[PDB]
């Protein structure tokens, strides 16, 4: 029913609001708060492996909030333990990239990182300007859609509840929850007087998201293959656990 979709949206909306690290309006307010050239050069002087470790810390902190986001979605908690893990392994970073759009300046192509808005040049030492460019591209694209917090919440829940992840056990139950989340997202988008082409634009973004996470995975696994002791000893346990 319509009431059931409204309740579902409220559950997911409140879970998101409770588990976002920063208020949307606060992030949007301080886009003028940018790294100075001296600060940029400081990051650029870091060796590749050190810059990566710093970035993994930030990613992992974001992921801890996403784990809590998932835990407060009633439909997610109803799933078996195996499927919860499978979904979070495959989907947590996707949610992080969606959440990035809340902390992105689409006009100036900057992202809120380590306390200030950073250009791609901040990430120079990672040695993968193509990947970084792709990340900023996704951010700029999503951030320019001006999604509300509730729309971001439902879109986040939608990608997390992907019934097509490998190794899932309760495929049917997850499919049901995902379909209902998508109907709720459609409803909210319409209510906010979005054109009907809004949702199909978002669905297209899902492919981009998986490609992004795909790159991150292959980069990390290559790093682990050459530098196994660095990964084992210096990267966050949750990070190693989710992605390696």
């Amino acid at each position: 029913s319509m009431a059931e979709l409204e309740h579902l949206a409220q559950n997911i909306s409140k879970s998101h609001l409770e588990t976002c690290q920063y208020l949307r309006e606060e992030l949007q307010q301080i886009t003028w708060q940018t790294f100075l050239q001296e600060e940029i050069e400081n990051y650029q002087n870091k060796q590749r492996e050190v810059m990566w470790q710093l970035c993994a810390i930030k990613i992992t902190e974001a992921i801890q909030y996403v784990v809590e986001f998932a835990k407060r979605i009633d439909g997610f908690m109803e799933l078996c333990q195996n499927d919860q893990i499978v979904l979070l392994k495959a989907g947590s970073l996707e949610v992080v990239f969606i959440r990035m759009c809340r902390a992105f300046d689409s006009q100036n192509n900057t992202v809120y990182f380590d306390g200030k808005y950073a250009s791609p040049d901040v990430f120079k030492s990672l040695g993968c300007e193509d990947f970084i460019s792709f990340v900023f591209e996704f951010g700029k694209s999503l951030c320019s859609m001006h999604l509300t917090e509730d729309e971001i919440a439902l879109f986040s829940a939608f990608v997390l509840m992907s019934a097509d992840r490998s190794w899932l056990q309760e495929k049917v139950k997850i499919e049901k929850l995902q379909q209902k989340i998508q109907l709720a997202l459609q409803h909210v988008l319409q209510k906010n007087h979005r054109e009907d082409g809004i949702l199909t634009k978002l669905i297209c973004k899902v492919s981009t998201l998986r490609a992004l996470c795909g790159r991150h995975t292959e980069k990390l696994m290559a790093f682990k293959a050459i530098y196994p002791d660095i990964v084992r000893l210096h990267f966050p346990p949750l990070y190693k656990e989710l992605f390696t």
Binding site: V67, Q81, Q84, I85, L88, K89, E241, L242
Partner: peptide
Amino acid sequence: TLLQLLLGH
């Protein structure tokens, strides 16, 4: 494991 812990499994 750590994920299992955080999920309360």
